[PDB]
Structures are given as structure tokens and as C-alpha cells.
Ligand binder design. Structure first.
Ligand SMILES: CN1CCC(c2ccc(-c3ccc4c(c3)C(=O)N([C@@H](C(=O)Nc3nccs3)c3cc(F)ccc3O)C4)cc2)CC1
Ligand SMILES: CN1CCC(c2ccc(-c3ccc4c(c3)C(=O)N([C@@H](C(=O)Nc3nccs3)c3cc(F)ccc3O)C4)cc2)CC1
Ligand SMILES: Nc1ncnc2c1ncn2[C@@H]1O[C@H](COP(=O)(O)OP(=O)(O)NP(=O)(O)O)[C@@H](O)[C@H]1O
Ligand SMILES: Nc1ncnc2c1ncn2[C@@H]1O[C@H](COP(=O)(O)OP(=O)(O)NP(=O)(O)O)[C@@H](O)[C@H]1O
Ligand SMILES: [Mg+2]
Ligand SMILES: [Mg+2]
Lengths: 298, 297
């Protein structure tokens, strides 16, 4: 349990390059230097922007042990922590980066099979979090990491203390905006938005609409529009994720089944120009990726 | 089959020489997947051997077998590039080989690590025997450190290259005299490898010319007892160097034996300071695996 979170000293790792920043911190590519060894092992380091106290560190540690305990091929595990004046969190470095930037940069080379398999894998990770009774609270395409093009994993989940102290309005369920209710069913809403981001190849939701006005348009019944590549079958799933009654939305278990069905005949459900020129990797290419970058069970 | 990737020269680059052995030169390299911007570390062995279409069919036939292994303590060949020279691709191990590792940590290795390594090498060799693959070049230099807690056997199965130096000082007597190679001659090499670990990387029969090794073995002389070994450990080595190959232990038996010793390591190895030596801890082991070593153990 406790042994799943490594407490690091400042002297055993170094930040080398900024990768980006989000709501709560700055992410670096870093190197871990095991004590007494000569190797330098790449890691990802999130340094929180606000400094904390030792008593606040007890809060951080209690949540960190939970995020270090996940065990699922589609969920990123928190690996280590360093309690400096600003706290540093350590996880596996994903050289491919997040799925949002990946779909934007490869938008002219992504076929229906990849898109639908990503939907399945994200739903599998979210179902695992629900099984663990952990609400994500910040699901979005930016918080899905690409381990390989064939294998994505959810990250940055469970941050109830950081979000409560303050928000991704355009990903949040209406009951979260209006009433600060976060459940697995509000995660289903965020999942629908994440799917919309993938199917639009990384468009910004409600582009140009101030966040302060989003709950009003949602109450009036407006929703994200049908992506050009989506058949009516896919868009109805998205719309069901955004129903006002949270208990009427699909369950992650059901979304796994439905997107898995679609992934068995992907060109019936997504209409992409060029789709027959793009396919999943041959077993040869997948075996090579896995041996070099992705040896976990999956 | 799908386990061996055929690579083109345009998708990988050699970056730095790591060293050279009997048959080639190993480089740290980079793989760039087509259509992607990432650069993925690999280890590349470029053979000295020249390449003809006829030789390439032979190389490919052997390569498919070496790409087919599936065991946590055995390295798998991953890919090949057949240009003017053969280039072989496998996972890059930043810690390097176990011989260099024990030489460099000569004053910091405890008995738990040493005996755990003996267990793991025996598990990898038992798998090769299960697959009917004779190693032919087992030695501490051909055991790679994936993490300090996890080693893997490499460079096995090279019957055609060795059949055309010879590692006399690791070879069973019947291999020196007649080029007979079996799993029981691998057991002899395993014994020498354990001796290398227990001496923290001493050279076997140091200063004795290779041409005189068979003379020394025929009279009953063997590698001497390492200072840290109790008689129980040294007798395992001596049993691996019995003249009658069928009398040597089997790898399957060595797994059981060293596993029993690894459960009480300070009874079987006497290392000064052993109680202040680092042990493999769960916290460090979970961190290593997550960062460098996610395969099923
Ligand atoms: C400021 N005042 C006082 C103190 C309170 C507070 C409470 C808890 C934390 C805390 C604890 C644990 C984590 C996080 C935050 C977090 O941001 N974490 C991510 C994560 O580390 N991201 C990364 N990116 C790249 C490298 S590390 C993460 C990684 C992962 F692998 C899986 C889930 C996950 O959430 C983990 C911070 C502050 C808040 C209000
Ligand atoms: C005249 N006539 C014509 C040609 C004949 C010939 C036949 C087969 C080969 C062949 C085929 C396959 C391999 C090897 C050699 C070999 O050296 N291989 C190692 C290996 O690649 N080492 C590495 N280090 C770092 C990166 S790659 C290796 C890697 C591994 F992961 C597991 C086992 C293994 O042996 C693989 C060469 C020549 C011989 C003589
Ligand atoms: N483990 C990782 N490996 C590689 N890049 C990462 C990793 N974690 C995060 N990043 C990238 O680092 C940058 C900063 O991430 P982060 O600070 O979490 O901001 P964010 O994901 O965009 N917004 P948010 O998480 O909702 O607050 C983004 O480009 C991430 O994709
Ligand atoms: N996958 C690998 N990752 C990192 N270093 C490696 C890898 N494979 C081999 N090396 C190192 O590369 C160097 C050259 O290896 P090699 O050419 O096989 O010679 P050798 O192991 O010393 N002797 P031999 O294999 O018996 O001919 C040695 O320092 C090896 O430890
Ligand atoms: Mg994030
Ligand atoms: Mg070698």
C-alpha cells in the first residue's frame, strides 16, 4: 500500500525541460538518478505552483497514496513524490504526450479504428476508477496520455482537494457547475465531451463562449454539435452523456460494450475521408512497440 | 513470423558505441517510428560478418527463433536490418551487463542480490532448455541488468557463428575437446558465471593461456572457492564442473536450490558488512518496475 508511493529526495532527481503547465502546476521532463548508480532514468515531474506546509503535506500524502494504488492498463499510476516548498509529483514520462495534442498533430492520418479504440480504452479506465470509487473530476482529452498510438491511459484524476479549493467548466456536468456535485455520472458527461474532442480532431468545445455563460446554454438545451465524421449512432451516445438527469446517462460499463461493438465495424460508425488508407498496426508493429515502450499486461 | 520486425535503415540511427564482442559491435541507437516525432532508444549489434542473400536466409531463420522467446529472464531479439552488414535490434539496457555491474559495485553488493541473480539466470537457462535452445556463450558478460533486481540472459543460440574466438574458459571439457554443446555443457558455463558473480567479476584462470585449460581440467583442478562462498555454494559450482555431463545438476534443480539459499542468504554467503548492504525493498522495486520494467515477473 504505502510502498507504492516512493518518497524521493531532492538530490536523486533533476528537472531538465519544461513540457507545459495546467491549472495546478508545471510539468517537466526529468531524470531520476538512483543512489549509488550511474544511470539516468527519464520521468515526468509535476511541480505544484502554490507552496504548501507540512500539515498540508499530510493532505497531499493521503490523496497521493490512493493515486499510487491504481492497477489498470488504461489508468496512469502516481509513482513518487518529493515534499519541497513546492511539492513535486513523479510519474512515468509519456514521450507521445497527451491525446489532445496528438489528434491535432496527426489529424490527417487518424482513421476510425484508432478513434473508436481510444474511446473504448478511455471508458475502460473510467470504469476502473468507478470500481475503485474514485471520481476523476478532470477528464478531458488533455488528461488522456498516449503511451503508444495503440494504448492510451487516463491521468490527473482524483484531485478533489485542488478543485474544491478554487475549473474546467466546458467539460463539467451541469450539476457540477450549479451545485458542486461530482459523481461517476458527472464523469460520464466529461467522457462525452472528451469523445467530442477526439471526433473533431481536437476542436475547442463551445469555442468563444465565455465559461460564465455555459450553464445557461446547457439549461436552455444547447449541446455540442454533431462532429462531421460521426454517424447518428455515435452522436446519440454523446448526447446521452449530456442528459440533465445524471442517472439517465449511460454507465461506463455500457459505454465499453457499445464502443467495442462499433470498433468491430468501425467504418459503419465513423465516416472519415481516407479511412481505407489507414489501419491499425500489423501484429509485427504492435509487438515491436510493446517490447520497446509498453511491456505491461494490457 | 510477427515477432521479428524487419527495419529499414531510414528508421533508426546508431548514436554511440557501447562495446565490441566476438562477432560484432553494439551501439546505443534511436528508433524513429514512421510518421512520429519521438525517438525511442534501442541497442544495435552490427556484425562483422558480410551479408549475401544465401547467408541472410540463414541469419533470418535463426533470428526468428531468437525473436520467439517469452520468459522474464531471457532477452528477446526484436528486429533486424539486412543491408551490406547485418544489424540486430533489441531493448537497450542502460545498466549494461552484470559482469561490469558487479565489478563497479564490488564493495556494495549484498548476499540477497547475488543469490537472487543466481536464481534468475537459472530460470532463464531452464527456459532455454525447455525450448531446446543451447546457449553456447553463457557468461557474466552475457547477462544484462534490466534493473538491479532483474537480470536477463542474452546472446544465446549462436551455433552458426561459433561453428565458423571460442570462450574456452567458460566451456565444458567435452566442448573444448570435441565441440559438443548441450544443455549440460551450459550448466558448466553457468557454474563459471556464478563464480564470476561470487568473485565480483574476477577473470577465470587469469594468466593461464587458453591452450592449457583442458590440461588443467583433466587433472581435476577447478576454479578456486570464492572468499565469500560457504562450502554449500562452492559445491554447487563444483557439481556444475563434473566430468560426467549427465552428473551435473539440472537448471530446474538449481532454481530450487538457489531459491532455498536466497531465503536465508547470510547463511550461505559471508560478506563483510552484509547487514549494512542495500536489500531489494518493495518501495524501490515498485518504482523501478513502473519506470523501467513493466513486464510480468
Ligand atoms: C493547495 N491547498 C493545500 C493542499 C491541497 C492539495 C491536495 C492534494 C494535492 C495532490 C495529491 C496527489 C496528486 C496531485 C495533487 C496531482 O496533481 N497528481 C497527478 C500528477 O502527479 N500529475 C502529473 N503529471 C506529470 C507528472 S505528475 C496524478 C498523477 C497520476 F499518475 C494519477 C493521478 C493523478 O491525479 C497526483 C495537492 C494539493 C490543496 C489546496
Ligand atoms: C558463414 N555463415 C553465414 C552467416 C551465419 C549467421 C547466422 C545467424 C546470425 C545471427 C542471427 C540472430 C542473432 C545473432 C546472429 C546474434 O548475435 N543475436 C543476438 C543479438 O542480436 N545481440 C545484440 N546485442 C545488442 C543488440 S542485438 C541475440 C539477441 C537476443 F535478444 C537474444 C539472443 C541473441 O543471440 C541474434 C549471424 C550469422 C553464420 C556463418
Ligand atoms: N506523464 C506525462 N508525460 C509526458 N507529458 C506529460 C505527462 N503528464 C503531463 N504531460 C504534459 O505536460 C503538460 C502539462 O500538463 P498539466 O499541467 O496536467 O496541464 P493540463 O493537462 O493541460 N491541464 P489540467 O491537467 O486539466 O490542469 C501537458 O502538455 C501534458 O500533456
Ligand atoms: N541490450 C543491450 N543494452 C545495453 N548494452 C548492451 C546490450 N547488449 C550488449 N550490450 C553491451 O554491449 C557491449 C558489446 O556486447 P557484445 O558485442 O555482445 O560483447 P560481449 O558480451 O562482451 N562478448 P560476447 O557476446 O561473448 O561476444 C558489452 O559491453 C555489452 O554489455
Ligand atoms: Mg493534466
Ligand atoms: Mg554479448
Amino acid at each position: 500500500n504505502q510502498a507504492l508511493l516512493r518518497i524521493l529526495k531532492e538530490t536523486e532527481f533533476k528537472k531538465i525541460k519544461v513540457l507545459g503547465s495546467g491549472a495546478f502546476g508545471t510539468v517537466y521532463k526529468g531524470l531520476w538518478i538512483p543512489e549509488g548508480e550511474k544511470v539516468k532514468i527519464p520521468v515526468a515531474i509535476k511541480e505544484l505552483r502554490e507552496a504548501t506546509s507540512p500539515k498540508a503535506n499530510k493532505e497531499i500524502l493521503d490523496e497521493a497514496y490512493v493515486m499510487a494504488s491504481v492497477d489498470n492498463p488504461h489508468v496512469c499510476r502516481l509513482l513518487g513524490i518529493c515534499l519541497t516548498s513546492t511539492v513535486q509529483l513523479i510519474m512515468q514520462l509519456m514521450p507521445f504526450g497527451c491525446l489532445l495534442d496528438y489528434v491535432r498533430e496527426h489529424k490527417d492520418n487518424i482513421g476510425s479504428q484508432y478513434l473508436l479504440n481510444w474511446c473504448v480504452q478511455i471508458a475502460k479506465g473510467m470504469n476502473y476508477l468507478e470500481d475503485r470509487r474514485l471520481v476523476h473530476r478532470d477528464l478531458a482529452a488533455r488528461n488522456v496520455l498516449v503511451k503508444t498510438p495503440q494504448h492510451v491511459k487516463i491521468t490527473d484524476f482524483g484531485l478533489a482537494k485542488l478543485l474544491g479549493a478554487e475549473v474546467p467548466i466546458k467539460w463539467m456536468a451541469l450539476e457540477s457547475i450549479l451545485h458542486r456535485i461530482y459523481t461517476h455520472q458527472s464523469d460520464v458527461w466529461s467522457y462525452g465531451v472528451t469523445v467530442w474532442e477526439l471526433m473533431t480532431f481536437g476542436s475547442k468545445p463551445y469555442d468563444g463562449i465565455p465559461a460564465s455563460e455555459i450553464s445557461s446554454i446547457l439549461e436552455k438545451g444547447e449541446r455540442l454539435p454533431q462532429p462531421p465524421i460521426c454517424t447518428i449512432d455515435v452522436y446519440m451516445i454523446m448526447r446521452k452523456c449530456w442528459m440533465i438527469d445524471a442517472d439517465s446517462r449511460p454507465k461506463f460499463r455500457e459505454l465499453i460494450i457499445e464502443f467495442s461493438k462499433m470498433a468491430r465495424d468501425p467504418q459503419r460508425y465513423l465516416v472519415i475521408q481516407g479511412d481505407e488508407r489507414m489501419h491499425l498496426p500489423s501484429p509485427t508493429d504492435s509487438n515491436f512497440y510493446r517490447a520497446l515502450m509498453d511491456e505491461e499486461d494490457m
